[PDB]
Amino acid sequence: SKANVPKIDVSPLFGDDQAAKMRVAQQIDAASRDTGFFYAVNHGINVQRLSQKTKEFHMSITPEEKWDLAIRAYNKEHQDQVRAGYYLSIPGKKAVESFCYLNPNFTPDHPRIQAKTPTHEVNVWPDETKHPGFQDFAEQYYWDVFGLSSALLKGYALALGKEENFFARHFKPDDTLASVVLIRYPYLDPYPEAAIKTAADGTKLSFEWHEDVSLITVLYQSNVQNLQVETAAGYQDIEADDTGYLINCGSYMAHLTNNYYKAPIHRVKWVNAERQSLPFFVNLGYDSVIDPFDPREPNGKSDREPLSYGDYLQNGLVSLINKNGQT
Ligand SMILES: CC1(C)S[C@@H]2[C@H](NC(=O)CCC[C@H](N)C(=O)O)C(=O)N2[C@H]1C(=O)O
Numbered sequence: 001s002k003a004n005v006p007k008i009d010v011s012p013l014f015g016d017d018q019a020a021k022m023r024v025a026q027q028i029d030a031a032s033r034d035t036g037f038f039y040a041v042n043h044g045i046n047v048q049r050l051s052q053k054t055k056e057f058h059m060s061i062t063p064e065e066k067w068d069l070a071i072r073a074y075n076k077e078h079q080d081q082v083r084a085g086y087y088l089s090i091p092g093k094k095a096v097e098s099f100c101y102l103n104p105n106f107t108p109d110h111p112r113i114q115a116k117t118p119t120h121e122v123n124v125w126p127d128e129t130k131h132p133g134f135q136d137f138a139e140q141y142y143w144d145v146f147g148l149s150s151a152l153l154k155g156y157a158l159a160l161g162k163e164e165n166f167f168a169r170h171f172k173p174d175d176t177l178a179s180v181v182l183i184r185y186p187y188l189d190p191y192p193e194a195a196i197k198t199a200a201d202g203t204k205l206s207f208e209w210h211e212d213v214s215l216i217t218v219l220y221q222s223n224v225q226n227l228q229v230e231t232a233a234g235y236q237d238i239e240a241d242d243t244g245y246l247i248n249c250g251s252y253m254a255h256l257t258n259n260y261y262k263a264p265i266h267r268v269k270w271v272n273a274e275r276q277s278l279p280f281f282v283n284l285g286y287d288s289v290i291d292p293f294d295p296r297e298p299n300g301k302s303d304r305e306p307l308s309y310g311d312y313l314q315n316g317l318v319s320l321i322n323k324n325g326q327t
């Protein structure tokens with residue numbers, strides 16, 4: 001059965017028509033209370049070019065380069081790379097591979113880098129001559145999707161009865177913990193069975209059920225259907241749409257809203273197809289704390305304790321590896 005995933009024209013969130021912004025907020029509210037997914041359309045980002053530049057990267061990087069960029073899970077020499085870098089495939093065992101990068105403003109002179117604060121790292125990049133234009137393209141993409149995400153956060157805020165900068169004031173270029181992951185799901189013949197997981201209902205999967213570790217997740221994927229969302233009605237297929245961004249809440253949103261906006265449980269079906277999954281995880285700053293609330297209660301009070309974003313994030317990232325494995 002197909003999940004209800006509405007297409008929402010988010011362009012008013014970039015402008016000054018406040019009533020039009022409220023009508024978008026209502027759609028976000030409805031989707032958030034239903035399956036928890038929607039497609040953002042009329043978002044302004046050139047996703048075809050994103051896909052093409054990502055393809056050029058994934059198909060030309062070499063094994064040597066992958067070792068040289070590898071996170072510490074794959075390369076013991078890179079002890080500072082917990083988040084940022086290359087996540088290698090393991091032919092015959094693990095099909096997916098990916099490249100993660102963080103805020104380009106996390107430079108060696110950034111105060112959180114100097115302090116060695118958890119979850120902050122300086123990005124690693126391949127050689128420019130081997131991948132001309134890639135670093136520059138990827139850094140600008142970070143800021144293009146940052147901008148889209150800021151507009152979406154205005155929509156969420158309004159949807160929850162707040163002023164539009166409720167979330168966005170904690171989402172800032174100098175300190176956001178947001179990440180881009182460029183994931184390659186390959187076509188393989190034969191496809192290794194160890195890379196295929198099986199759900200309790202029999203569905204072959206590439207990644208097991210989870211909630212995202214994010215405030216919201218802003219995802220581009222190729223036009224190959226693969227995601228499913230759990231609803232009271234069972235797991236439902238999310239249709240692909242390679243012209244839109246698939247949006248959903250992460251568990252920090254669920255905490256902040258006392259589950260009024262749940263972090264939907266979702267999973268990735270196994271498909272033997274060469275495709276791309278390019279999430280942007282919208283994370284706040286390390287010390288950002290928003291007081292939890294509950295938009296279902298007249299006084300809006302919640303019995304949840306405030307949680308800093310950095311505490312959330314550090315704990316969540318490890319937990320997800322422990323539950324569904326090292327990606
Ligand atoms: C379904 C997803 C988009 S979300 C799910 C899974 N998510 C993660 O591993 C989180 C990675 C966070 C990142 N390294 C960081 O440091 O910020 C992943 O990747 N999966 C994607 C996929 O498999 O397509």
Ligand SMILES: [Fe+2]
Pocket residue numbers: 210211212266
């Ligand atoms: Fe996810």
